[PDB]
């Protein structure tokens, strides 16, 4: 057992200066010992990894898997503590920065050993609009990269 | 091995031989136990050799700290802000003298792999080879199968 992710909401930053950009909020939440496997949660956790919380909620209400409901409870809970506890003004203005799933303390049942599998779920929400997705690189980017690799090369193994 | 280790090119610190030569070793910091069997050769080094050494190069400032250590060290600091900490643990005076002169003689650059054994900054004098050295020109700059 380690429990470092719960403590991450207790970092206190020194107050800022007027000539300094506003730091976005960061809300670390998790659930432990979910009775589900860590590699079935990987798909649900992977699904929502840059989405706004409204898009994440909306995608998990219509998913048929067992873990979707659990993650939806974790995200509604973290939206609550986002606003109440951590000074986020808009409920809507969050996005999922981190969503992973580790393994939990499993049990062993003798039938012939069979593991009762548990998992956790870790989410960091960050205040702000979700960052724009990475554009696919164009033929201009490929051509510049190639030519820059040609400009880069040296006479090798000499002076 | 070379693919595990970092590498660098052969360099100086501030063109160290061009104008004048500057000793790259600023500080030595000896720390020597008073009662302690490992810093015996350090003790006999402070008593015999460190004053002669300190006079043979005055650009180096030497600090002998003499606390109760369990392993004695020397800490060489260089002009480019590198720090080499070496132990003089259970060494004779002669071995410490060769180590301290070794630290004096070298510079602060890393003793990682050096790629080439040389470093010109002006490698070419007659002009570096491009594919139109050693080619004749044509009349009116024509190329093959050019009509006019």
């Amino acid at each position: 057992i380690s429990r470092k992710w719960e403590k991450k909401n207790k970092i206190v930053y020194p107050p800022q200066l007027p000539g300094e950009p506003r730091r976005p909020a960061e809300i670390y939440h998790c659930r432990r010992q979910i009775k589900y496997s860590k590699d079935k949660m990987w798909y649900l956790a992977k699904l929502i990894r840059g989405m706004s919380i409204d898009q994440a909620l909306a995608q998990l209400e219509f998913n048929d898997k067992k873990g979707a409901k659990i993650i939806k409870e974790v995200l509604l809970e973290a939206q609550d503590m986002a606003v109440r506890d951590h000074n986020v003004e808009f409920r809507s203005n969050l996005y999922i920065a981190e969503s992973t799933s580790g393994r939990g303390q499993c049990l062993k049942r003798i039938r012939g050993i069979m593991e009762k599998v548990y998992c956790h779920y870790f989410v960091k929400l960050v205040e702000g609009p979700p960052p724009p997705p990475e554009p696919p690189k164009t033929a201009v980017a490929h051509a510049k990269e190639y030519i820059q690799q040609l400009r880069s090369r040296t006479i090798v193994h000499t002076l | 091995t070379a693919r595990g280790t970092p590498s660098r090119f052969l360099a100086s610190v501030l063109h160290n031989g061009l104008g004048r030569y500057v000793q790259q070793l600023q500080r030595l910091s000896f720390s020597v136990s008073r009662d302690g069997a490992s810093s015996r050769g350090a003790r006999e080094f402070v008593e015999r050799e460190v004053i002669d050494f300190a006079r043979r190069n005055p650009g180096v400032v030497i600090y002998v700290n003499s606390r109760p250590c369990c392993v004695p060290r020397v800490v060489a600091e260089y002009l480019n802000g590198a720090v080499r900490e070496e132990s003089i643990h259970c060494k004779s005076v002669e071995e410490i003298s060769t180590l301290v002169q070794k630290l004096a003689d070298q510079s602060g650059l890393d003793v990682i792999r050096i790629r080439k054994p040389f470093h010109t900054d002006n490698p070419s004098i007659q002009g570096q080879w491009h594919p139109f050295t050693n080619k004749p020109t044509t009349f009116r700059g024509l190329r093959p199968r050019e009509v006019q």
Binding site: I11, P14, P15, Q16, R23, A25, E89, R91 | -
Partner: protein, 211 residues
């Protein structure tokens, strides 16, 4: 659960018989559940005798000076979060009420000169002395966050504060500590907040309606 009745009814339905056991040690309280006589703001030399018969070296003419230093110093213990001094300066009815909500955020309270002299108002009374004081001051606040961004009050600008601070003393080793702070019902609203709030309506299950 939400109360003791819910837990004892759940322990009766479950079968958890908790025997009330007799212990010779009890809890040695040094405070009071609230205020003896609620001083409602716009003859009690009885209780001054009932204080001087225990303390016997006590000048009220010097006390609102002392009540200033018990006040101000306590508030400076919020600037550093020094709880160990606050237990000397403030009561245990008053310690959570001033330090709980302020946790995980930095406050930068400061005092500047009083508009009026602080003056004692009333005094009441195993024995708990209790003295209410009127203070009319100028203070500064800046409550920041976990992330160090301002959520209450301009840092420089002083504001005029009325403070009906109630002190309390145990009557062996105790002293005068802030017990509470009466806020009158006529008092003006405080500073507004830098952020905006949505307040939800009733969350309706499908079987009910909004009216």
């Amino acid at each position: 659960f939400k109360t003791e009745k819910e837990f004892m009814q759940h322990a009766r339905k479950a079968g958890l018989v908790i025997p009330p056991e007799k212990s010779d040690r009890s809890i040695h309280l040094a405070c009071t559940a609230g205020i003896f006589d609620a001083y409602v703001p716009p003859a009690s030399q009885v209780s001054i005798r009932r204080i001087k018969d225990y303390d016997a070296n006590f000048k009220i003419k010097d006390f609102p000076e002392k009540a200033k230093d018990i006040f101000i110093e306590a508030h400076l213990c919020l600037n550093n979060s020094d709880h160990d001094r606050l237990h000397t300066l403030v009561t245990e009815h008053c310690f959570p009420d001033m330090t709980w909500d302020i946790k995980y955020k930095t406050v930068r309270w400061s005092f500047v000169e009083s508009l009026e002299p602080s003056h004692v108002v009333q005094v009441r009374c195993n024995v708990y002395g209790q003295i209410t004081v009127r203070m009319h001051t100028r203070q500064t606040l800046a409550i920041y966050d976990r992330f160090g961004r301002l959520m209450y009050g301009q840092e420089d600008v002083p504001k005029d504060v009325l403070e009906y601070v109630v002190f309390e003393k145990q009557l062996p080793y105790g002293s005068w500590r802030m017990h509470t702070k009466i806020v009158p019902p006529w008092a003006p609203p405080k500073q507004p907040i830098l952020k905006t709030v949505m307040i939800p309506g009733p969350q309706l299950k499908p079987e009910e309606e909004y009216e």
